C-alpha cells in the first residue's frame with residue numbers, strides 16, 4: 004500500500020499516516036486471500052493418505068490408461084493429457100506475486116496417487132486401506148451400481164474396454180482441436196491480469212493535481228503548497244487501491260466456491276460411485292479420473308449410456 | 322472428549338470468526354483517532370476554537386474520513402457474512418443428510434462408511450460427531466469372475482468368489498464370511514466359453530441330497 | 533522478533549510466518565547531469581530596460597540557449613512583489629525549461645493585484661491576462677524614482693484570452709491615459725531543455741544504486757546502458773504508470789535504462805515465543821547476494837534456517853514446496869506429500885477385510901456471526 008501510493012517519498016508517507024490504518028487493512032485483506040488459495044488447492048488434491056503407485060505391468064484386462072497416467076520419459080511426470088492442458092493455458096510499483104505452496108510437480112504427484120488408487124483398489128482406498136481388486140471385477144461392481152447385471156460386463160469385456168479406450172483417445176483429440184475448451188481457467192487468469200493492469204494505470208492519473216508524479220510536485224513546490232497537491236494524489240490512489248482489493252475479495256469468494264465444488268466432486272466422483280444425476284456427467288456414472296491443470300482441475304467422467312432401444316409390450320403383473 | 326480437552330486449536334474454526342469480527346470493530350473505533358488532514362481528530366476541540374466558516378472546513382475532513390472508514394467496515398461485514406451463510410447452509414445440509422438419515426456420499430459425513438451422526442451445540446456454530454465403519458485386517462484371497470459347472474457360467478448374486486488355496490467359497494464383499502457355493506447364492510448366465518478367467522468348481526444344488 | 537511483536541501489537545508471538553517490513557537498497561551517491569551551456573540569460577535586458585511598454589501593448593522577450601540564474605532577482609532587494617505560481621522562488625535554479633518568456637509593461641500601483649492568474653478587472657480582462665493554469669513568477673517594483681503618456685484598454689467587445697495582446701484602435705460602440713508608477717516583469721515558464729538554472733554536473737555512474745537528476749528529471753534507481761532504439765529526437769521513454777524508464781544523457785547523448793533499486797517484502801519465521809526466541813528471515817523475491825545458514829529458494833532468500841535433505845510434514849510454509857520447522861534450531865526442507873504405498877495388484881487377487889473398527893470423528897462448522905449494529 005505505502006509504496007503504491009507514495010513510492011519512496013517521505014513527505015507523502017507522513018501525510019498517508021493521517022488516514023490511520025487503511026493500508027494495514029488493505030495489506031491484511033490481500034494476505035488473507037493469498038492464504039486461502041493454498042487452502043483451496045489442498046482441499047481439492049490432498050485427499051489421499053498415501054501416495055499410491057501403479058504396478059510395473061499394466062494388465063487391466065484390455066483397459067488402457069496410458070493417456071491419464073504419468074509419462075515417465077518427460078521432465079514433468081505429467082500424463083499426455085495433463086501435458087496438453089498445461090501447454091494450452093507492476094513489480095516496481097509495489098505489486099508482486101507469491102508462489103503457491105504446492106508446486107506443479109507436487110500436484111501432479113497427488114493426481115497420480117489418486118489414479119493409482121482408483122485403478123488398483125476401486126473406492127476402497129477412499130474409505131479405509133487400499134484393497135486390491137482385478138480391474139474387470141471392479142468394473143463389474145460398477146455395473147451392478149447402475150442397475151446392470153455383472154454378466155453384462157463379463158460377456159462384453161472386449162467391447163467395453165475398446166469403447167473406453169476409444170473414448171479416452173477422443174478426449175485428447177478433442178482438446179487439441181478446441182482452443183476455447185479451457186476458457187474457464189483462462190478467464191480467471193485474464194480477469195486478474197486486467198485488474199492489476201488497471202491498478203497500475205491509475206498511477207498516471209492526477210486526480211486534480213498539477214501532476215501525477217510526486218517527484219515533479221516535490222521538485223517545484225514548498226511543503227505548504229506541495230502537501231495540497233500530494234493530498235489529492237493520496238486520496239485518488241488510496242481509492243484506486245481500495246477498489247482493487249474489494250474486487251479481489253469478491254472474486255476470491257467465487258473461486259472458493261468453485262474449489263469447494265471441485266473438492267466435493269473429487270470425493271464423490273473419483274473416490275466413489277455417485278447416484279446423483281448429472282453430478283459426475285451425463286449418463287449413469289461408473290467412475291472418474293482427475294487430471295491436473297493450471298490453477299484448476301479437470302475431471303474425466305466415465306459413464307454408461309443406454310443405446311439402441313426396442314419397443315416391447317408390457318404388463319404390471321402375470 | 323479427551324481429544325478435545327487436549328487440543329486448544331480444535332475449535333479454531335469458531336475462534337477465527339470471533340477474532341475477525343472483534344478485530345474489525347477495534348479497527349473501526351481506532352479510526353476515530355485519525356485527523357484525516359484536520360487540525361484535530363476531536364470535533365469538540367475544533368468547535369471550541371473555530372467559528373463556523375473555518376470550523377466547517379475541519380469538520381468536512383473528519384466526515385469524509387469517518388464515513389469512508391465506516392463504509393469500509395460495512396463492505397467487509399457483507400463479504401464475511403456471505404461466507405458464514407455458505408457455512409450455515411452446509412451445516413444445515415449435513416444436519417439433514419448425516420443426522421436425519423444415512424448418507425451414501427463419500428466423505429460427506431466423515432471418512433469410512435457412514436453409519437450415523439450426532440449433533441452437538443457450540444458457540445456460534447455446530448459440531449458433528451460422525452460414526453463410521455472402517456474395514457480392518459484384510460487378507461489376500463484368489464478370485465475369479467465366475468464358476469464353471471456342468472457347462473454353465475455361475476455368477477455371485479451378492480458377493481464375490483474367493484479361494485483359500487484349496488477350496489472356493491462365496492463371500493460378502495466388505496467382510497470375510499465364506500459360504501459354500503450353491504444354486505441359491507449364484508445365478509446362471511451363458512456358457513463357460515465367454516467369460517475370461519472362469520474357473521472349474523462345483524455348485525451345490527440343495528435338493529438332490531433329500532430328493 | 534521484536535519487530536514482529538510490535539507489528540502484531542503483542543508481547544508474545546504465535547507459531548507462523550509474518551510479514552513485518554520491507555527490504556530496500558539505499559542509494560550511495562547523487563548523479564547530476566545538465567546540458568553544457570555557457571552564456572547567461574538576458575533577464576537584465578527586460579528588467580533594466582530604459583522604456584517599458586504600455587499595458588495595452590505589452591512586450592515579450594524570449595529567453596533561450598542560456599543559463600537562468602534567478603537568485604539575482606530573488607535576493608535583489610528591489611522588488612515590492614515577487615510571487616511565484618506552480619514553482620518556488622528559491623528552487624528555480626534547480627529547474628530546466630523548454631522556454632522562458634519575460635513579458636514587460638507599465639502599470640499603476642492599484643493594478644498590481646491584477647497581474648495574477650484567476651483575476652478579473654480592466655487590466656486582467658482587457659490588457660494583460662494570465663491563465664488559471666499559470667506557471668511562472670510575477671515580479672514588480674516601484675519605479676517612481678526613475679520616471680510621458682501610457683495607455684490601457686478601457687473598452688472592448690469581449691475579454692482577452694491568456695497571453696493575448698490586443699493593440700487595435702477601432703471605435704467602440706478604446707484606450708485611455710493613466711498612484712505610483714510600477715514596472716512589471718512576468719517570467720512565464722514553459723522536449724530537450726533550452727533554459728536551465730546554474731546547477732553543476734557530476735560524473736555519470738552506472739551499475740550502482742544512485743539518486744539522479746537528468747536535465748531536471750529526478751528519481752532513484754540503477755543506471756545501465758540501454759539497447760532501446762531511440763529516434764534522434766526522443767529524450768526519454770515512459771512506462772504504463774507514466775514513469776521514466778530510460779533517459780538521454782544531456783552531455784553524452786547516451787541512452788540509459790533506469791531500473792529501480794532492489795526491494796521486497798520481509799517476513800519472519802518463528803516458533804511460538806513460548807518455545808524459542810530464535811527466528812529465520814525470508815527476503816521475498818530477493819536474491820541472497822543483494823540482501824547484505826543462507827538458503828536460496830523460489831520464495832526468496834531464507835536466512836537463519838538450516839536446509840536439510842530429510843522431508844517432513846509441512847509446519848510453517850515458505851512456498852514453492854519449502855516448509856520450515858523448529859527441531860534445537862530452525863530448519864528448512866521440501867515437504868512430504870505422505871508415505872508411498874504399492875498396492876499388490878494382480879488380475880486374480882482380491883483383498884477382503886476379516887475385521888472392522890468403529891470410528892468417531894469430529895467436524896466443526898460456523899453457523900452464525902455476532903450481530904453488530906453501528907449508529
Ligand SMILES: *[C@@H]1O[C@H](CO)[C@@H](O[C@@H]2O[C@H](CO)[C@@H](O)[C@H](O)[C@H]2NC(C)=O)[C@H](O)[C@H]1NC(C)=O
Nearest residue numbers: 061062065066067068069070083168171172175
Ligand atoms: C495404449 O494406448 C496407446 C495410445 O494411446 C498405444 O500407443 C500407440 O500405439 C500405436 C500402434 O498401435 C502407435 O502408432 C502410436 O504412436 C502409439 N502412441 C503412443 C502415445 O505411444 C499403446 O500401445 C497402448 N498399449 C496397449 C498395451 O495396448
Ligand SMILES: *[C@@H]1O[C@H](CO)[C@@H](O[C@@H]2O[C@H](CO)[C@@H](O)[C@H](O)[C@H]2NC(C)=O)[C@H](O)[C@H]1NC(C)=O
Nearest residue numbers: 159161162163164165166167168169170310311
Ligand atoms: C453394440 O454396439 C457396438 C458398437 O457400435 C457394436 O460393435 C460394432 O459392431 C460393428 C459391426 O460388426 C463393427 O464394425 C464395430 O467395429 C464394432 N465396434 C466395436 C467398438 O467393437 C456391437 O456389435 C453392438 N451389439 C449388438 C448386439 O447390436
Ligand SMILES: *[C@@H]1O[C@H](CO)[C@@H](O)[C@H](O)[C@H]1NC(C)=O
Nearest residue numbers: 309310311312313314315316
Ligand atoms: C415405437 O413405436 C412408435 C410408433 O407408435 C415409433 O414412433 C417409435 O420410434 C418406436 N420406438 C422404437 C424404439 O422402436
Ligand SMILES: *[C@@H]1O[C@H](CO)[C@@H](O)[C@H](O)[C@H]1NC(C)=O
Nearest residue numbers: 458459460461875876883884
Ligand atoms: C498380499 O501379497 C503381497 C505380495 O505380493 C503383499 O505385499 C501384501 O501385503 C499382501 N496383502 C495382505 C492383505 O496380506
Ligand SMILES: *[C@@H]1O[C@H](CO)[C@@H](O)[C@H](O)[C@H]1NC(C)=O
Nearest residue numbers: 484485486487488489490499
Ligand atoms: C479351505 O477351507 C476348508 C474348509 O474349512 C479347509 O478344510 C481347508 O483346509 C482350507 N484350505 C486352506 C489352504 O487353508
Ligand SMILES: *[C@@H]1O[C@H](CO)[C@@H](O)[C@H](O)[C@H]1NC(C)=O
Nearest residue numbers: 062064517518519878879880
Ligand atoms: C493373469 O495373468 C497371467 C500371467 O501372469 C495369465 O496367464 C492369466 O491367464 C491371466 N488371468 C486373467 C484372468 O487375465
Ligand SMILES: *[C@@H]1O[C@H](CO)[C@@H](O)[C@H](O)[C@H]1NC(C)=O
Nearest residue numbers: 469472513518519520521522
Ligand atoms: C474346465 O473343465 C473342462 C472339461 O470339462 C476343460 O475343457 C476346461 O478347459 C476347464 N477350464 C478350466 C479353467 O480349468
Ligand SMILES: *[C@@H]1O[C@H](CO)[C@@H](O)[C@H](O)[C@H]1NC(C)=O
Nearest residue numbers: 575576577579580604605608
Ligand atoms: C538591474 O540593475 C540593477 C542595478 O545595477 C541590479 O541591482 C539588478 O540586479 C539588475 N537586474 C537585472 C534583471 O539585470
Ligand SMILES: *[C@@H]1O[C@H](CO)[C@@H](O)[C@H](O)[C@H]1NC(C)=O
Nearest residue numbers: 567568569781782783784785
Ligand atoms: C558537452 O558534453 C558532451 C557529453 O559529455 C561532450 O561530448 C561535449 O564535448 C560537451 N561540449 C561542450 C561544449 O562542452
Ligand SMILES: *[C@@H]1O[C@H](CO)[C@@H](O)[C@H](O)[C@H]1NC(C)=O
Nearest residue numbers: 329544546804805806807808
Ligand atoms: C508453554 O509450553 C509449556 C510446556 O509444553 C506448556 O505447559 C505451557 O502451557 C505453554 N504455554 C503457552 C502459553 O502455550
Ligand SMILES: *[C@@H]1O[C@H](CO)[C@@H](O)[C@H](O)[C@H]1NC(C)=O
Nearest residue numbers: 818819820821822828829830
Ligand atoms: C542470484 O544471483 C546470482 C548471480 O550472482 C545468479 O547466478 C543466481 O541465479 C541468482 N538467483 C536467483 C534466485 O535470482
Ligand SMILES: *[C@@H]1O[C@H](CO)[C@@H](O)[C@H](O)[C@H]1NC(C)=O
Nearest residue numbers: 838839840841842863864865
Ligand atoms: C543434501 O544432499 C546433497 C546431495 O544431493 C548434498 O550435496 C548436500 O550437502 C546435503 N545437505 C545436507 C544438509 O545433508
